[PDB]
Amino acid sequence: MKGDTKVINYLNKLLGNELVAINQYFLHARMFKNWGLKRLNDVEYHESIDEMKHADRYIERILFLEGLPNLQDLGKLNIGEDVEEMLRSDLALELDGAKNLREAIGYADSVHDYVSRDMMIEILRDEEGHIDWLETELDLIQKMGLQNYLQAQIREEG
Amino acid sequence: MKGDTKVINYLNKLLGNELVAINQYFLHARMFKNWGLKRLNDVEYHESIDEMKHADRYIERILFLEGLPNLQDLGKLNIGEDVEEMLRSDLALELDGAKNLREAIGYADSVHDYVSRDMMIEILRDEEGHIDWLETELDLIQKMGLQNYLQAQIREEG
Amino acid sequence: MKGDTKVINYLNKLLGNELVAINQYFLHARMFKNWGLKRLNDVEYHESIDEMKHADRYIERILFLEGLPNLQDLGKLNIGEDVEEMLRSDLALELDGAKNLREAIGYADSVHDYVSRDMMIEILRDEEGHIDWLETELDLIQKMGLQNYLQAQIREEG
Amino acid sequence: MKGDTKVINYLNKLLGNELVAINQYFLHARMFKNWGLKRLNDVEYHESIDEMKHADRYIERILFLEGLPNLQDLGKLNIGEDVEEMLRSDLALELDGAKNLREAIGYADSVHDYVSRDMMIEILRDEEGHIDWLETELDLIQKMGLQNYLQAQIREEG
Amino acid sequence: MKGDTKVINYLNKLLGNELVAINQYFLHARMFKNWGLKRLNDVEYHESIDEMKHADRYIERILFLEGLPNLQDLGKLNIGEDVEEMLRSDLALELDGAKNLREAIGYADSVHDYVSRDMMIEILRDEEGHIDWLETELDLIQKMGLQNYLQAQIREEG
Amino acid sequence: MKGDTKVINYLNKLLGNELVAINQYFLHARMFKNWGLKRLNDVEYHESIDEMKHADRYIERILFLEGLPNLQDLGKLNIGEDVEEMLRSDLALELDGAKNLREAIGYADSVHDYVSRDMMIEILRDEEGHIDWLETELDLIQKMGLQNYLQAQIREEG
Amino acid sequence: MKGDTKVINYLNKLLGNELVAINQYFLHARMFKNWGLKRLNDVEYHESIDEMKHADRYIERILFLEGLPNLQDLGKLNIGEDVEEMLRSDLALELDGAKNLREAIGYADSVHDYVSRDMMIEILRDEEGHIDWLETELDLIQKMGLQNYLQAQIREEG
């Protein structure tokens, strides 16, 4: 069912946001794992899987609406070399994406694409959850100190 | 079965004590949870449920005795902005309530309301248990330090 | 994630609406139970639990958004001394709250807080369900008469 | 297998009778449910499902016989605004349909379509069952009175 | 709970859209079945059941809001005499209905009926799914040819 | 219980019709099987078993009524050398038999043998089912073509 | 354990090869799915998951060897607009990658990194399996024709 170019553009931009996030979260996961921080690897890994699923949602929506998903343009990945740094990159990225999400959600309403705006609000509720975990983690390093924080990552929780 | 105004007054005052406690414990629970302190959220949450049940006990007793429960007057909640502070508010509150409980228990005996005094001693045995957990927690922060204490709350026990 | 004062104000006002409702529904439940009306106690009790859960939803949202839940101000509880009267208080209260809910939902959209507006519409769909049960009950008293209606409450349904 | 126009006409008229009945029974069901009369909603709902199945039987028979089912013409639905009234509409409708059924059954025999007359007698045995329930219900209102009758509908039987 | 005439009008128009769809999908189902196309009958049959459930949703919403569902006016059913033709009717119909759905969803928001707009977006997400299956089917006939397409329908999938 | 010569004659003629059908359907079944058309063999085989059971029904009825079943006269079997041809023989035969069935059913009524007419209408409902499968098959060859139709028979369905 | 720059370069180039393959296979999967070709979507989807796992293998090896995985550079995705075309892109890509794999395997031996060459030969045995499926598919279109081939994809195998 063909449906509104602008909507398909927002969708493709949002997809791009996802693509950079799966890559950055996956490398971070494996960097943490590598350091022996099992808890951080377990969490960052599943968020990457979440992003992966967010992306498939867009790809399918774009295809229904009769557009062509763009999986060719990749964004800048800001990796970071220490955990406190890595986590902040993750947060900044999440924040930018949420911003794009709000822009896109308002427009779909204007244009009456309520199902595209329904899906996006679902995805935004998720992002805001990634945002909460990162914020909490960053404060914990601040509150218990880095060495206690590091010792607290060597075994994954349950 | 109508039964002694003074008793119904003590019961209503005690109920009020409970009402402020459910509110303060519930906000504290969610403040802890929010900070990522799962263990503190789990405990403070169940104490709120305990208080909630204490209250239903009073409401029913007052109704049997033919009085009208007072759920309109709320007390001062002293929240606190740091855990050590939050826990001390909880303790002080518990202490005040226990004091009222003893006053009320002695009077029911004078007046021969042994079933109201039976129920209250049950509730007091419970309060004294809330009092013990808080005292132990506050000393632990004192003994292992705050950062170790904080690291020790990030996963709930079993 | 800090987010819009006005939204946090609406959220806190809505929470207050909930707090008065849990109290009024719980006292009503126990008044009915006390009279031997098992069916009315069972229903009014679970609605109180629903309101209780609505409240926890707000408390957590306010905390995420970085505001402070207000559990200190309690509203006027209009109890009532006969069932027809009690049920009408419940209805009026529900109606007022729904009104606040619509005001708050429209504003979150303006401000782009779609996740806060998502949660609220969920809670509103629930309120409108409480509103339907009360309306039906009040008409049944009108249609079968009060004594038949009363006889119809002495055993809880399933 | 092409087979007798007149038979296909009777079949289509009978189908029409069914279509109006599914609609009237379904609205009535939901009107009762809405009023809190669970027993009346449960029964009227299943009769609607019975009519629904009667219709599919005709649609398939018409198609075999090589005719075209007519699902375009809808009859007059006589709703009614009170239960005694609603039930009487249901009865009248059933009565009219049974009358058409007998006309159609006699003709299929003349014409030797014994399988069409076999199916119809099955459907008629069913109608006469809908007719019996309605008659019994209407008399019960007459015998115990409307308020007792109404109180007797608020919980579905088993 | 009485609520906005215009909303109840849109709801009734939408219900009408559903009614024509259940009828057209059900006849099509049985026409396919009749031809020996089991796969097409199985799918078209369940979509009819979906529409049937969509309708019950409206009927109940209209009744809550205190309006009267209109099950008297039936729309034009455009049947079709060959499968490619039948499927295109189904698609066109779906498309028209989706259009009405968007009009109605925007208005409920204006008027603040968020629960009616919630339900409708759910129903629209469904329609868009019926729309996707039909589009895919029509292209498959185009891509493998009609005879291969026909041979591919004689046994239902799983 | 001795009962009406004419009825016993119709019964014996009908039995004869069955006997030729079991033979033709069984040879056809095995011819199809032989060619590797599993689906056609499976179906034609079970119809032969159905006819076989129809026959036993007559044999027993004739014996009760005190007549002697005639299993000595066999009819003309029209085999056919290609599937389209084979299926058409089967159809023609079925059609002739149904015709005899209607003649016999009307007469039993005249004569009041309602149990013989009951059994026969059961058997006729079955024949009309054999008639429907053959008609559908013959059209499918017409609609998808013979080679696609043939490829569609090499594995039995379920 | 730090280990040979050249090896880490080959590893990173190979990882890049994987990254483009996951993207192209995933879009193709969803394009096929979209067209209603369930079998092609199921297969192309799992190959994408295989590539995804190949990539994680490299990322971890690079990290052990003390290099930094490069997830920033994405290659040219050659999509294609028809299935025959899409499958050929997939094949060409696979072929190029296998070529790089052989170059890298020979060098690790020279340099004595037998564990890196062990892992790579495992991954190459896999690629050669992706290569075999594509070759077989492309010939099947050639041998049965495209319409028969297309009809053969509408239900996933098992």
Ligand code: HEM
């Ligand atoms: C367009 C890019 C990609 C897309 C859309 C994508 C999509 C997916 C999806 C939807 C799944 C299945 C989700 C589920 O299990 O429910 C999956 C699984 C996974 N992905 Fe990705 N992915 C991509 C890139 C990546 C990257 C860069 C890596 C590896 C470096 C990766 C590693 C994995 C792994 C390891 C799994 C799970 C395997 C399993 O448990 O069976 N993905 N991917």
Ligand code: HEM
């Ligand atoms: C007069 C005030 C209140 C009364 C008497 C009351 C009473 C109760 C009771 C007796 C229960 C059931 C206990 C059990 O599970 O055995 C309950 C459950 C609970 N209450 Fe309250 N409550 C009140 C205020 C609060 C507040 C302020 C909150 C929320 C902010 C709250 C949140 C809950 C929750 C979440 C549960 C458990 C829900 C579940 O697990 O199903 N309550 N309450």
Ligand code: HEM
């Ligand atoms: C206002 C019109 C109608 C309404 C609202 C309606 C509603 C329904 C509903 C809600 C159900 C149950 C859904 C479920 O199983 O979860 C049902 C079942 C069904 N309907 Fe309808 N229906 C209508 C018209 C039709 C027509 C025209 C036909 C028949 C020609 C039909 C045939 C059926 C059948 C066969 C079933 C399923 C029976 C079973 O599996 O027990 N319906 N209908």
Ligand code: HEM
């Ligand atoms: C060319 C003539 C016929 C052939 C080759 C034939 C063949 C068969 C075969 C192979 C079976 C299945 C055997 C099994 O169950 O393993 C069968 C079953 C049977 N036959 Fe015949 N038959 C013929 C004539 C007759 C006649 C004249 C009658 C009836 C008057 C008859 C009555 C039955 C019955 C009742 C069964 C068993 C039904 C069951 O238990 O499901 N057959 N026949």
Ligand SMILES: [Mn+2]
């Ligand atoms: Mn995401």
Ligand SMILES: [Mn+2]
């Ligand atoms: Mn995220």
Ligand SMILES: [Mn+2]
């Ligand atoms: Mn207590």
Ligand SMILES: [Mn+2]
């Ligand atoms: Mn306590």
Ligand SMILES: [Mn+2]
């Ligand atoms: Mn609420």
Ligand SMILES: [Mn+2]
């Ligand atoms: Mn409520």
Ligand SMILES: [Mn+2]
């Ligand atoms: Mn009927």
Ligand SMILES: [Mn+2]
């Ligand atoms: Mn009926």
Ligand SMILES: [Mn+2]
């Ligand atoms: Mn629908």
Ligand SMILES: [Mn+2]
């Ligand atoms: Mn639809």
Ligand SMILES: [Mn+2]
């Ligand atoms: Mn027979």
Ligand SMILES: [Mn+2]
């Ligand atoms: Mn036969």
